[PDB]
């Protein structure tokens, strides 16, 4: 369902949950009930975030409850991604490179699975940059090479070795870092944030 | 806030994906500068339609990049005194059927929709139903007797329901209330939840 | 039908985890037969420490092994009639503070658990607070005036309530009731959601 | 918290929650009050499901609504498998093996997370034998070999071919199944049930 035909639908259901007519809607917001009407006929497009705010807020509820979701993007059920069409960003922690990540497979049906092949390119742990923590779990498979993993205080972290074949589970919001084991060169992890 | 809110959630999305404001800005066909002016709060202006699209190349929700409702609590607490309320006509089949008189309401709990309902019409076989509605909904006979139906409306379950009656209607269970046969009119408090 | 949803979700489980039933029984110290007679409905007599030992062998929880409340509906909807509503007192310190008149409830919406609240005492100053409850609560004033206490108790928000006045309290906020100084009592309805 | 100890104090929250006193939730269980008393002080170690179910009846809800989460089984947010560590199970489906699964790390903080690293045995698509589908998405990325990749319906599935490094989503319900491509011999899998 697009922006427009999704706003469409969810401002209408909201109205009449609340009781509304377009007139006291359109009252609430410096426009005409007419202006209303059209919006739940489709042509809300131009709406700007500011005023879409103003509709969230009027009808006390938020803008998300007011948006269609990601959609659907697969295949009866399935979407597959091909070696050679994997995206690839540079992952530069501290004015110097850390991570070359080989984004997999995603999906609007799962918005919060970002899987990835990251190539961690330091192999000094005192080169260990945190991250804040991530919104949602993450999975790591060591695949090539031999992982030093930090988490929790940067100040006082925990630490781990990590041969190639083990896997972790690292909690939503608990920073961590990676590098390859002291002097090993360089590592492999396929990273599953879900 | 709006912008606020946006200008955070999606900087966290656009990380999320190991994206940095050039990967993001080329997908949206705008420069670095534009985007990373968004995550400084500057979105404000960006149309329901371009909100689709940078969602889209995200692979999220709008809803995903946008705030929470809000909170409009007093410590945790909002009241609302009577005479306040606001009072709509409910016209089913060109009948005044309902007269809704909205009681408290918060952005902490969008979906409550409280409400008094005058019953106007005492003919149960005119009773006049609406086709469910999303969520659950509890109530209770405040004055009179209410004539319920619920279900099939060729064939729906019934009930004659007294003052001091309470009700739980699921969603999406389509109902429909007037006064018992000849009573005149009678009141309940809805609560959608 | 506890030990029935009970035998199919641990099935369900159980094959999540890849896992037989020789595999399973071993982590229990049981007989593979034991494990299939469990699925086959037979697990009625499992205490909760042992439901407790598996769900932790299967590194979930009981609840993911054991099914949903259950449907007590009549298609769709459940009634009660007045008269037949569960009456409790209400004792805080060794004085009737409140009096419990129980509307209806269902397992499909475990968490509705709505109440006509006779309202005792009428002296602000004797006011006792409850230290706040899981989830939300609608209030609707049904008798008399109501005066409301929240928050901090020992420096409290407060409200006047008429007749007909509505309030929303949060999750986990403190709060407390009387009737107006010198009222006598009041009455309210009260659904936590 | 364990079950006896997280079941004593979520009755006593539920009795507490429907306005119940020991006596009336008693008078509902074939019990004394004292004996109520008792469970929510820890002793209701020994009921049974069946009377759980009942208890869970009166109180208008759920066995789960009464007991404990999961539980807590990490290490400041973390927890790690290492390689040797990986349970090892046969997959047999219509009287012939199929798959070897090497499970990979698990957390009763997200239950749901299942990984794991399948080796596929057959390299005859015909073979190819369709489970029912899984609750919960799952993500999968191609290890070793080539994969034929089956799903929907098992009369008329979709189908794709799957070199190594591809990468699939498969959401919740979706009956699939797995073989190497034909005549390929075998391949590897790293399949994440989330
Ligand atoms: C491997 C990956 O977790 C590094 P980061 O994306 O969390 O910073
Ligand atoms: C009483 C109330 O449920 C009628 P409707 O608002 O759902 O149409
Ligand atoms: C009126 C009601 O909220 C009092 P309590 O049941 O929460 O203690
Ligand atoms: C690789 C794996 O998905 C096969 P199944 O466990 O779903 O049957
Ligand atoms: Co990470
Ligand atoms: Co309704
Ligand atoms: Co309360
Ligand atoms: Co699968």
């Given at each position: 369902?697009?922006?427009?035909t999704g706003?469409?639908?969810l401002?209408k259901?909201?109205?009449?949950?609340?009781?509304?007519?377009?007139?006291?809607?359109?009252?609430?917001?410096?426009?005409?009930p007419?202006?209303?009407?059209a919006?739940?006929?489709?042509?809300?497009?131009?709406?700007?975030?500011?005023?879409?705010?103003?509709?969230?807020?009027?009808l006390?509820?938020?803008?998300?409850?007011?948006?269609?979701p990601?959609?659907?993007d697969?295949?009866?059920?399935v979407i597959?991604?091909?070696?050679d069409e994997?995206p690839?960003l540079?992952?530069?922690?501290?004015?110097?490179?850390?991570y070359?990540y080989?984004?997999?497979?995603?999906?609007?049906?799962?918005?919060?699975?970002?899987?990835?092949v990251?190539?961690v390119?330091?192999?000094?742990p005192d080169?260990?940059?945190?991250?804040?923590?991530?919104?949602?779990?993450?999975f790591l498979?060591?695949?090539?090479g031999?992982?030093?993993?930090?988490?929790?205080?940067?100040?006082?972290?925990?630490?781990?070795?990590?041969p190639?074949?083990?896997?972790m589970?690292?909690e939503?919001?608990?920073?961590?870092?990676?590098?390859?084991?002291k002097?090993?060169?360089?590592?492999?992890?396929?990273?599953?944030?879900?």
């Amino acid at each position: 369902k697009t922006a427009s035909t999704g706003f469409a639908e969810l401002l209408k259901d909201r109205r009449e949950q609340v009781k509304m007519d377009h007139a006291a809607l359109a009252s609430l917001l410096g426009e005409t009930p007419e202006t209303v009407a059209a919006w739940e006929n489709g042509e809300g497009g131009e709406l700007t975030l500011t005023q879409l705010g103003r509709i969230a807020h009027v009808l006390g509820t938020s803008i998300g409850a007011l948006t269609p979701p990601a959609g659907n993007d697969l295949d009866d059920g399935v979407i597959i991604q091909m070696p050679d069409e994997r995206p690839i960003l540079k992952g530069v922690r501290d004015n110097v490179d850390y991570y070359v990540y080989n984004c997999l497979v995603r999906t609007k049906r799962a918005p919060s699975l970002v899987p990835l092949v990251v190539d961690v390119l330091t192999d000094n742990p005192d080169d260990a940059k945190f991250n804040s923590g991530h919104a949602g779990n993450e999975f790591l498979f060591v695949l090539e090479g031999e992982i030093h993993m930090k988490w929790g205080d940067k100040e006082n972290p925990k630490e781990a070795l990590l041969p190639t074949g083990a896997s972790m589970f690292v909690e939503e919001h608990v920073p961590h870092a990676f590098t390859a084991a002291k002097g090993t060169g360089s590592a492999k992890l396929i990273a599953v944030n879900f």
